[PDB]
């Protein structure tokens, strides 16, 4: 399946998603550091049969599996700048998002 530029990202805990607007892209004006999520992208995947004690862990805490990787774009390490600009390119099939 396709991958989304969504902001409803896996485990990352609502602080890294603070910069991201609704469509999932950083604001033009934000000062990121190394590690911050510029563009949150979630990718499809399979189940992959989490081993026991991971089964047992998620059964004790009920935190069921995602099924979707967090293959998003975070800033490289050591850089700390301002995000001066953001260009978007949607193919003619894909409709568009709010940021676009």
């Amino acid at each position: 399946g396709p991958e989304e530029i969504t902001a409803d990202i896996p485990n990352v805990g609502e602080a890294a998603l603070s910069k991201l607007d609704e469509s999932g892209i950083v604001y033009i004006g934000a000062e990121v550091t190394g590690g911050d999520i510029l563009v949150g992208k979630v990718t499809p995947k399979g189940e992959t049969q989490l081993t026991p004690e991971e089964k047992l862990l998620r059964a004790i805490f009920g935190e069921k599996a995602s099924d979707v990787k967090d293959s998003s774009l975070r800033v490289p390490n050591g850089v700390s700048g301002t995000v001066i600009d953001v260009q978007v390119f949607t193919r003619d099939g894909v409709e568009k998002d709010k940021r676009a």
Partner: protein, 558 residues
């Protein structure tokens, strides 16, 4: 002497320019393959044939390897290469040579070859049709067809006539002649009886594969017969030192009765008295002999000559097919020269063409009168095209999809020109009839991927493969976390009662190769899976508590 002078002058100079080699290599040589092999051997010598002279330091610094067994071998090749001039290494040159040895065919010659193949197959036809069990099994095939275990057109492709009704009437006529001939060997006219039966059959016609099956049936029949002959004679010729004259005077001529062997122990000879201890196995071999004599419709020798005449026809027609293929190899090369740059080498094109040309030669009929080229060119080009479409890409695209790719390329190459810049995929799907998703996947089909040895390049001379990472590894931090969580799970289950601990270890898959289920768990606890569910739930609730699962909480990642 000449090339010897060159070698010695090099070995004293330590190098050789291309110019000096050209001056010294012989003048008979015309091709560049012998010249490049000479250069390779002479470099192995080794003297390092160059284009320009080496610097004074490049002689001292250049390592010298490697004498001297290869020195002797190289010199003994180079001393001999100068004599034989026609020497060549390409398989293509050898093929063109040995194909030019044949002489081309003419139109009437193709008619002769086609008629000779027809004569050979017709002789095979007659030899097989003089086998009665052949027509018996054919009637059985048509009967089991008539029971609708096959099709009235599947078993055979009709007869030499254009409706299956006249065909079934031919079947009934064949059955009538068969009954009037088979139970009427009372020999004076039963000869001509089975003659007439085979003749009335010869107007018929079967599917090729069933006829091949009949061929193999007669083959196995004659083979078991002659192998009875083998175990018989070889246990008399070598187990009894049997003179072959006694064989020909007793065995041949009758070949069936027990007079030539079972009446062969009273020949007043020593080997005849030897034949007792070889009378058992040879006696059983005569048993199979007479059994097959019943299983032949006539004696063994007559069926011998029947399958022999079949073999004569088959060999004639096979040599005829061979002569036609030999003639038209040039045609096959002429066709294959058109496809030489679409991914398949030249000899592979020629070989696919040769297979297709054999197939066309098997199908040629000169009753029409067209040129052999005009027909076989079809099968040749189809064979070559399927070959390229099947075994030219590393990732194999089915043939129809490749036709669709060719059509996409054609329509795009036309539309970009006629429409301006380029056809956007919506424009192609509109111009084509496709649904514009099929077109997009056809576009997305990758093409001829790449050599992973491709340069990157010039940074470190590192080919492309150095930067493709392995995404299947559990990185050492991941394995560390895994085993930490394993130990933590153990040290948590320690804080549970024995029942809870066993049910949680077994219900989950800890320290055992399962994954036990509720019925199989409650078997060991004698619960009907409901109390076992409750016990699992209680253990999970207990471990749910904080101050018992803060570490296990930390193992959660979010």
């Amino acid at each position: 002497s000449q090339l010897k002078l060159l070698v010695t002058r090099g070995k004293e100079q330590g190098y050789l320019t291309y110019a000096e080699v050209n001056d010294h290599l012989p003048e008979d040589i015309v091709d560049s393959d012998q010249i490049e092999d000479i250069i390779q051997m002479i470099n192995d010598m080794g003297i390092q044939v160059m284009e320009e002279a080496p610097d004074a330091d490049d002689l001292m610094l250049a390592e010298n390897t490697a004498d001297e067994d290869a020195a002797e071998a190289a010199a003994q090749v180079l001393s001999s290469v100068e004599s034989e001039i026609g020497r060549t290494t390409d398989p293509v040159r050898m093929y063109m040579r040995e194909m030019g040895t044949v002489e081309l065919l003419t139109r009437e010659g193709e008619i002769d070859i086609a008629k000779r193949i027809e004569d050979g197959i017709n002789q095979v036809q007659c030899s097989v049709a003089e086998y009665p069990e052949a027509i018996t099994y054919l009637l059985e095939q048509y009967d089991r067809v008539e029971a609708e275990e096959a099709r009235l057109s599947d078993l055979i492709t009709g007869f030499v006539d254009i409706d299956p009704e006249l065909a079934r009437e031919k079947f009934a006529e064949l059955r009538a002649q068969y009954v009037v001939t088979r139970d009427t060997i009372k020999h004076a006219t039963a000869q001509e009886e089975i003659l007439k039966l085979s003749e009335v059959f010869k107007q018929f016609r079967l599917v090729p594969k069933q006829f091949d099956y009949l061929v193999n049936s007669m083959r196995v029949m004659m083979d078991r017969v002659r192998t009875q002959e083998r175990l018989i004679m070889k246990l008399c010729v070598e187990q009894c030192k049997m003179p072959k004259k006694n064989f020909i005077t007793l065995f041949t001529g009758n070949e069936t009765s027990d007079t030539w062997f079972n009446a062969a122990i009273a020949m007043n000879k020593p080997w005849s008295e030897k034949l007792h201890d070889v009378s058992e196995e040879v006696h059983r071999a005569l048993q199979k002999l007479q059994q097959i004599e019943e299983e032949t419709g006539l004696t063994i020798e007559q069926v011998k000559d029947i399958n022999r005449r079949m073999s004569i026809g088959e060999a004639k027609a096979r040599r005829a097919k061979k002569e036609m293929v030999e003639a038209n190899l040039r045609l096959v090369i002429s066709i294959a020269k058109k496809y030489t740059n679409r991914g398949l080498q030249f000899l592979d094109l020629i070989q696919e063409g040769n297979i297709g040309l054999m197939k066309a030669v098997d199908k040629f009929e000169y009753r029409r009168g067209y040129k052999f080229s005009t027909y076989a060119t079809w099968w040749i080009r189809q064979a070559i095209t399927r070959s390229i479409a099947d075994q030219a890409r590393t990732i194999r695209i089915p043939v129809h999809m490749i036709e669709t790719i060719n059509k996409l390329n054609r329509i795009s190459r036309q539309m970009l020109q006629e429409m301006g810049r380029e056809p956007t995929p919506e424009e192609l799907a509109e111009r084509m009839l496709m649904p514009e998703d099929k077109i997009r996947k056809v576009l997305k089909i990758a093409k001829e991927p790449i050599s992973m040895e491709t340069p990157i390049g010039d940074d470190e001379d590192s080919h492309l493969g150095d930067f493709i990472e392995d995404t299947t590894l559990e990185l050492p931090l991941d394995s560390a976390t895994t085993e930490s969580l394993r130990a933590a799970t153990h040290d948590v289950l320690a804080g549970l009662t024995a029942r809870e601990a066993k049910v949680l270890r077994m219900r989950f898959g800890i320290d055992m190769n399962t994954d036990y289920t509720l019925e199989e768990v409650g078997k060991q606890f004698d619960v009907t899976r409901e109390r076992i569910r409750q016990i699992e739930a209680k253990a999970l609730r207990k471990l749910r508590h904080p101050s018992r699962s803060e570490v296990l909480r930390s193992f959660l990642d979010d």
